[PDB]
């Protein structure tokens, strides 16, 4: 006669412990801080050339080069300063939904409905770009992929799983399980020893790369989580879901700090990103424009409204000089 | 005001853009069809006739027209999270097995899937071609097992023609977008006959799209 009431008792105990640890709120502490003035960002560059919906982008570590993936089977590498196309890579499968840039800058990665992560090498003796590796083993569509170094990569699939791969041998070094729905977003810690995954079961999880088991679980959203990002200091993270709500979670207190939502906004959220100092929170929406939130006061401070279809990807450079937004109208825009 | 090495970069970018533009118009001459079904419905039969894991792409030609078909039935995921990738397809090809009205209930699942697909906010103007397979098996089975068991509200004869018409009507009145899209029902036979049906349907779709983009419609 197996019983599951002990699980309910454990959940109740965890909830009681979280409640007993909430002596105040983040809003009550940042009440005396000076509000951020109205943020006016202007478009500097418009990167044209994609002929279909753009589904992901990633910035280079040097804050000058970026890579964009589109559904016409093209990965384009842009020099953002001069809007020059450094490379144009044709994909074997046109149904791509993610892309990544190596920290060193020698490789790029892509994946999609083919359940295969392709790693392309950019530095070759010949003048072309060749498919360095093809990692297979996922039974669902690939949602996100992030590089640890030139040899290890971490990916999440729509089969409710994440995987840490060793590129040299092409085998899954580690697997991460526990989500009851498709995993949609994945974010790496600054020190690359832990990462957060947000899935369709309205839940985020904190993993351990070296060991390989889930450490903490964060709930609170009422619908699928589509995007996730890490705070610069590595002790908090922001999530965005389909219920028109961003949320901030703190690792040490194991709770939810603040909710970024407005009554007028009823569309979902596709992208989430922070600024260099972490004071601003960018968020891309399906209402064709992006919003800037004061991460310490939950007050909207600006709107970026230069796009004509759902904003799909959003990124901020390492030095925080510019913000790049890519939408379904096949245009990437740089805002400064 | 550019340097010696800053102008060759612009030349390379212009060549890359030229190649991108050239490749863009080559992929716009191919008809893209999205193949859907309830599984074990005869999707495989349809694929075999027309030609001469993740997603499977099949290319073929029929009377100087290029067709690309994307079988996506091997994706055990949430359909809501990747259906919008197929927003610009020319047509959908929905396969249904007629001989599954007695097995287990599967017919009702097929109707539910058809209703979900046809009334999506992404397919408000994308035509659907409905294939009904296992016609001979349906004829053999119906004369031994009545259709009234599957549909308690059915009122009519047991003969094959009336039941087939009833099933076709029940599948065809499930769309609320009776204005912007058409449904081309066809009972799949053993013969190059299905390819002709698909060719006629896509020709109608192409003519309507050409009228829409030029400006008359």
């Amino acid at each position, epitope marked *: 006669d197996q019983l599951r009431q002990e699980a309910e008792q454990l959940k109740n105990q965890i909830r009681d412990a979280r409640k007993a640890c909430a002596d105040a709120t983040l809003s009550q502490i940042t009440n005396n801080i000076d509000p951020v003035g109205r943020i006016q960002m202007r478009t500097r560059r418009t990167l044209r050339g994609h002929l279909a919906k753009i589904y992901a982008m990633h910035w280079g570590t040097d804050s000058r080069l970026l890579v964009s993936a589109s559904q016409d089977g093209k990965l384009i590498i842009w020099d953002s300063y001069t809007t020059n196309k*450094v490379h144009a890579i044709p994909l074997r499968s046109s149904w791509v939904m993610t892309c990544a840039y190596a920290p060193s800058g020698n490789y790029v990665a892509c994946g999609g409905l083919d359940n295969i992560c392709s790693i392309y090498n950019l530095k070759t003796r010949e003048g072309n770009v060749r498919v360095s590796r093809e990692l297979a083993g996922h039974t669902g569509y690939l949602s996100c992929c992030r590089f640890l170094d030139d040899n290890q990569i971490v990916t999440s699939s729509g089969d409710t799983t994440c995987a840490l791969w060793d590129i040299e041998t092409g085998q899954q070094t580690t697997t991460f399980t526990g989500h009851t729905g498709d995993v949609m977003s994945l974010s790496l810690a600054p020190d690359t020893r832990l990462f957060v995954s947000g899935a369709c079961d309205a839940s985020a999880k904190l993993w351990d790369v070296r060991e390989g088991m889930c450490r903490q679980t964060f709930t609170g959203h009422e619908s699928d989580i589509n995007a996730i990002c890490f705070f610069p200091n590595g002790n908090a993270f922001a999530t965005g879901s389909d219920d028109a709500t961003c949320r901030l979670f703190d690792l040490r207190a194991d709770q939810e700090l603040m909710t970024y939502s407005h009554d007028n906004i009823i569309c979902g959220i596709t992208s989430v990103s922070f600024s260099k100092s972490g004071r601003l929170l960018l968020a891309g929406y399906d209402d064709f424009n992006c919003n800037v939130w004061d991460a310490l006061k939950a007050d909207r401070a600006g709107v970026l409204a230069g796009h004509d279809n759902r904003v799909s990807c959003l990124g901020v450079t390492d030095d925080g000089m510019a913000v790049a937004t890519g939408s379904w109208d096949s245009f990437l825009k740089i805002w400064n | 005001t550019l340097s010696a090495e800053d102008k060759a970069a612009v030349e390379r970018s212009k060549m890359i853009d030229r190649n991108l533009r050239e490749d863009g118009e080559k992929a716009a001459r191919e008809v893209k069809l999205l193949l859907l079904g309830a599984g074990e419905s005869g999707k495989n039969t349809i694929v075999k006739q027309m030609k001469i894991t993740g997603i499977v792409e099949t290319h073929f030609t029929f009377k100087d027209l290029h067709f690309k078909m994307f079988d996506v039935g091997a994706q055990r995921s949430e359909r809501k999270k990747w259906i919008h990738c197929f927003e610009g397809v020319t047509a959908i090809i929905f396969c249904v097995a007629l001989s599954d009205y007695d097995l287990v209930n599967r017919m009702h699942a097929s109707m539910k899937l058809f209703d979900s697909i046809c009334n999506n906010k992404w397919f408000t103007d994308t035509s659907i071609i409905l294939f009904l397979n296992k016609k001979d098996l349906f004829e053999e089975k119906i004369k031994k097992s009545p259709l009234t068991i599957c549909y308690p509200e059915y009122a009519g004869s047991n003969t094959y023609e009336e039941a087939a018409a009833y099933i076709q009507c029940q599948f065809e009145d499930l769309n609320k977008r009776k204005d912007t899209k058409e449904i081309y029902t066809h009972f799949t036979c053993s013969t190059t006959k299905n390819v002709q049906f698909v060719f006629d349907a896509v020709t109608d779709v192409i003519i309507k799209n050409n009228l829409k983009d030029c400006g008359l419609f």
Partner: single-chain antibody
Amino acid sequence: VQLVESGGGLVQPGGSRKLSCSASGFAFSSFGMHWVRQAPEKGLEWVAYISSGSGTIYYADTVKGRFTISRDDPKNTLFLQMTSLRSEDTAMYYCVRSIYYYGSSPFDFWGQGTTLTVSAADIVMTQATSSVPVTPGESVSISCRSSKSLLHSNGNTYLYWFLQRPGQSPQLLIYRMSNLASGVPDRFSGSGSGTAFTLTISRLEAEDVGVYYCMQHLEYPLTFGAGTKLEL
């Protein structure tokens, strides 16, 4: 990657000669290609350049009109039709590839060369020292100077360093005065200012014997230095 060139013999003055540069081992259509000559017992100088796609063509002022360049992408061959050959065209012609994008390393690979023996506003780069007798183990610095400042508004100082081993072809060491070429040992370092340039070697082995040449790429009539021999 391999460039082999043939078609150089003995031509009477005023004749016509054709050179062929066969490429095999890389994407030939994506590479702009140069022609570089080296007169016997003298330095090497630029001759002609044709870009990828045959868009822009540049000739030296002492070669313009007499020489024409042409590439054949389908079978990866580079041509140089010379007309009205003079007695000053006796040299060894090199085939050099160069690809230009953000962060690339032009003039990376050089072919072996073809000996031709005819019978009988430019930035001047100065290498005052031509002979440096030095021993392995220590550090030797190679200096260079240019009439015009090579620093550009974009922030890149276009200066290149090449090493020509005895009985070999020039090889790239440093591009844009700071970046080290792929395959070059870390013992080589480069630095300088907008008009003064230096090349320093930390540890010197027996394979460093050769001639070191400068190179400018801010302006099209690309100019080499006089060379600085490093005897054992």
